[PDB]
Design a protein around this ligand. Structure first.
Ligand SMILES: OC[C@H]1O[C@@](CO)(O[C@H]2O[C@H](CO)[C@@H](O)[C@H](O)[C@H]2O)[C@@H](O)[C@@H]1O
Lengths: 269, 263, 265
């Protein structure tokens, strides 16, 4: 008898959650929500181009009420697959919300039901209810929903202003969908596209590197995936790190307001 | 430094904006001379759009020959010129340094914003036959100049359904008339010669010419950025539209549209 | 027939048309004694809309046209909508709008008198026809509701702009319920359902039996809502049982509007 029931009564929290939801709705059409006693993770392990995304929330930073029971005491977790825009559309009016309730239900079929109690001046407030269709993922499939292992990065560099990067890759994408991203321990990072009739290279410098030769570590990637990740970030993150594994993968590690986001983009072909 | 052409701008927008006014073809021909740069795009013998940026607009501008010409992909060119975004903020400029070594070499762009530097290598092509519409002020039957600002809304509401746009200019009423003839609909746009918008009116004969409207549609881009526009037709029936555009530094630049009549 | 509009009334006439273009493909026009009547109907004849602009809505209103006539005509909604397409260009540049017709004329003339002496003339073609009518009686409807359009606008906000049908129903405590409706089959791709439960105090009037519920076209309702919200007017809904039509009404001092929508059986 697995179950989940949570509530948010704090305005700032309700909005923070909503923003995070709008974000993953950008990074992936479909995602998996992992529920634990103290956390909530949004997971995308779509292997193709096997780009992965791992988002983690600390339940206590959002909910004033939180309760769940996994499949079994031993493995006290729950994995629900859902359509991202569904969760965003549900949080659509949370701007004028007094409270938010989320609860795993099974009326017509399994759903994550979200109830938004709108702000009111009387004793009776308007209520918006949304029944989000979810698919419970069986324990056997949980293995393919674990956060990717982080092989030590050849280079780990602080990322530049994301809005600026977005603009640049936005335009580069109009020229090619292949992109080379490179960086070094000297605080330099370059974005590069090369086609027969036009080449473009954007040089970022004085970026800094985290403690612990200056040849660069590079990696060829699908530009559309880099655009996706950047398009998702609504604001420049507190801590934003780019970790590259020469010719193998770029790994982004963001930490904005106690909410970490790990995006993984593998090399091409 | 054997560079046929070298140019610089503390503000790329003093170039990218004008170039966007004539961006309806993927390719354009660049013509540089001691006096400045002329970019031209053509639509197969029917339409020609030219943008001219006088050398005085640039901070650095030098040509090492009598004239230098080359063809480039305008779309890529504009994509690179706005590599840093299209919504810059006050006090946030993107500078440009253009370099074109010579025949057979790529156009090089160097842009920097906030210290970030973008390098662009845009291959050049062999120019092609560039149409010649010699709109001599001695061939001009009628000429008119309007205040661009108040024509934008109206001009964007031209029934694109009709395949043609008919222009009427005359010393008699109506003075200046644009007419369409679309799906079960005849429509007319009239501007009186004594209008506040009418800064100059010199029609000494009644002319009525037709043009395929879709050929004239792209002329809207230039209209939006201009502050003035003069309209002229000649004895052949060709249309000439000259747009006066003021850049961010108050300097003036012109865009010109020529269109053959429809028969 | 001659109708001359000025001031803000030009912009409101434009809105009425946009709002009408969201129901039917043909615009029916009847200059009546008590006002200009603009009507349209569904492509399936399941929706009916009508706006009646009282005489004082115009600066000059002359229903009768010289020559053997008593005008009743239909015009391509698209052609008429193009005239008022840009509510922006209206609000700003347009000062006067004059709609005219002669007995020996073949086209309907709409002439916008714009700033700086600019003038735009539209010659629309029309077809003489019979008065467009529908059958419905609000007075015999057992249930009705009345609330400011702004409020219903908020009631419909949670749903998707693309939602086709919606269910309106009365709950206990006199709570009004709006629920998204869909079709289809024990297949996957089950749709998310949204429900909005409104307080009783949100309605100026509510006379319906609990458990009562009807489903209708939201895309079409929104046509009347948009016009009503902007004009900040109250909206009434008169309905019966599933299968009978739902009647949506608004009433200003210079105009009347009715949208008669069908309900699933
Ligand atoms: O008094 C209400 C009664 O009038 C009718 C019949 O005349 O409606 C007429 O007037 C409406 C506009 O007020 C038109 O939309 C309608 O087409 C016309 O018949 C009845 O329909 C209504 O119950």
């Amino acid at each position: 008898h697995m179950k989940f029931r949570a509530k948010i009564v704090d305005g700032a929290c309700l909005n923070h959650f909503t923003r995070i939801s709008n974000m993953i709705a950008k990074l992936a059409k479909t995602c998996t929500l992992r529920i634990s006693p103290d956390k909530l993770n949004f997971i995308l392990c779509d292997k193709l181009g096997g780009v992965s995304m791992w988002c983690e929330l600390e339940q206590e930073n959002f909910f004033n009420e939180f309760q769940m029971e996994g499949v079994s005491a031993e493995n006290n977790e729950i994995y629900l697959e859902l359509t991202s825009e569904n969760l965003s559309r549900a949080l659509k009016t949370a701007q004028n919300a007094r409270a938010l309730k989320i609860k795993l239900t099974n009326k017509h079929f399994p759903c994550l039901t979200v109830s938004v109690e709108l702000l009111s001046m009387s004793s009776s407030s308007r209520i918006v209810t949304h029944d989000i269709p979810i698919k419970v993922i069986p324990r056997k499939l949980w293995k393919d929903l674990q956060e990717p292992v982080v092989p030590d990065p050849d280079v780990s560099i602080y990322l530049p202003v994301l809005k600026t990067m977005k603009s640049v890759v936005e335009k580069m994408k109009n020229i090619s969908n292949h992109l080379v991203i490179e960086a070094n321990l000297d605080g330099e990072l370059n974005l590069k596209i090369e086609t027969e009739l036009v080449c473009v290279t954007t040089h970022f410098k004085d970026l800094g590197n985290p403690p612990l030769v200056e040849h660069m570590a590079e990696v060829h990637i699908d530009i559309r995936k880099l655009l996706q990740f950047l398009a998702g970030q609504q604001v420049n993150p507190t801590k934003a790190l780019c970790n590259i594994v020469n010719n193998k993968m770029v790994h982004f590690d963001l930490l904005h307001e106690d909410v970490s986001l790990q995006y993984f983009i593998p090399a091409l072909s | 430094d054997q560079y046929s052409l070298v140019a610089s701008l503390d503000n790329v927008r003093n170039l990218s904006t004008i170039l966007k006014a004539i961006h309806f073809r993927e390719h354009a021909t660049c013509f540089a001379t001691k006096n400045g740069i002329k970019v031209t795009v053509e639509n197969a013998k029917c339409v020609q759009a030219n943008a001219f940026i006088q050398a005085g607009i640039f901070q650095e501008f030098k040509v090492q020959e009598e004239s230098v010409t080359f063809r480039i992909n305008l779309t890529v060119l504009l994509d690179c010129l706005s590599i840093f975004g299209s919504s810059p903020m006050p006090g946030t400029l993107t500078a440009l340094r253009m370099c074109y070594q010579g025949y057979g070499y790529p156009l090089m762009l160097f842009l920097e914003e906030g210290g970030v530097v973008t390098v662009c290598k845009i291959n050049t092509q062999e120019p092609e036959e560039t149409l010649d519409f010699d709109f001599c002020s001695t061939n001009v039957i009628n000429k008119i100049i309007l205040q661009s600002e108040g024509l934008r809304e109206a001009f964007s509401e031209l029934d694109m359904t009709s395949e043609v746009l008919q222009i009427t200019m005359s010393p008699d009423k109506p003075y200046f008339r644009l007419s369409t003839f679309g799906n079960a609909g005849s429509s007319h746009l009239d501007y009186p010669k004594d209008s506040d918008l009418m800064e100059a009116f010199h029609c000494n004969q009644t002319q009525v010419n037709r043009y395929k409207i879709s050929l004239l549609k792209p002329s809207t881009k230039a209209l939006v950025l201009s502050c003035k526009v003069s309209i002229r037709t000649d004895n052949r029936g060709f249309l000439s539209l000259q747009y006066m555009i003021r850049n961010e530094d108050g300097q003036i630049c012109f865009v010109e549209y020529y269109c053959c009549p429809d028969e | 027939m001659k109708c001359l509009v000025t001031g803000g009334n030009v912009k409101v006439l434009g809105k009425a048309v946009h709002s009408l273009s969201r129901i039917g493909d043909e615009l029916y026009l009847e200059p009546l004694e008590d006002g200009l009547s603009l009507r349209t109907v569904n492509s399936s004849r399941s929706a009916y809309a009508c706006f009646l602009f009282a005489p004082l809505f115009f600066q000059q209103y002359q229903a009768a046209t010289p020559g053997q006539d008593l005008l009743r005509c239909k015009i391509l909604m698209k052609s008429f909508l193009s005239v008022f397409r840009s509510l922006a260009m209206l609000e700003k540049t347009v000062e006067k709008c004059c709609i005219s017709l002669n007995g020996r004329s073949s086209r309907l003339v709409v002439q916008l008198h714009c700033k700086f002496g600019v003038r735009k003339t539209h010659n629309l073609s029309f077809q003489d026809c019979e008065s467009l009518q529908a059958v419905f009686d609000p007075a015999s409807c057992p249930h009705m509701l009345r609330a400011p359009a702004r409020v219903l606008g908020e009631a419909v906000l949670p749903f998707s702009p693309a939602l086709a049908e919606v269910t309106l129903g009365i709950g206990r405590g006199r709570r009004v319920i709006l629920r998204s409706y869909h079709e289809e089959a024990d297949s996957t791709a089950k749709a998310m359902v949204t429900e909005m439960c409104l307080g009783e105090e949100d309605f100026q009037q509510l006379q319906a039996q609990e458990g009562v519920a009807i489903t209708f076209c939201l895309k079409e309702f929104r046509g009347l809502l948009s016009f009503a919200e902007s004009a900040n007017l109250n909206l009434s809904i008169h309905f019966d049982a599933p299968g009978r039509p739902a009647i949506f009404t608004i009433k200003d001092s210079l105009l009347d509007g009715h949208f008669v929508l069908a309900t699933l059986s």
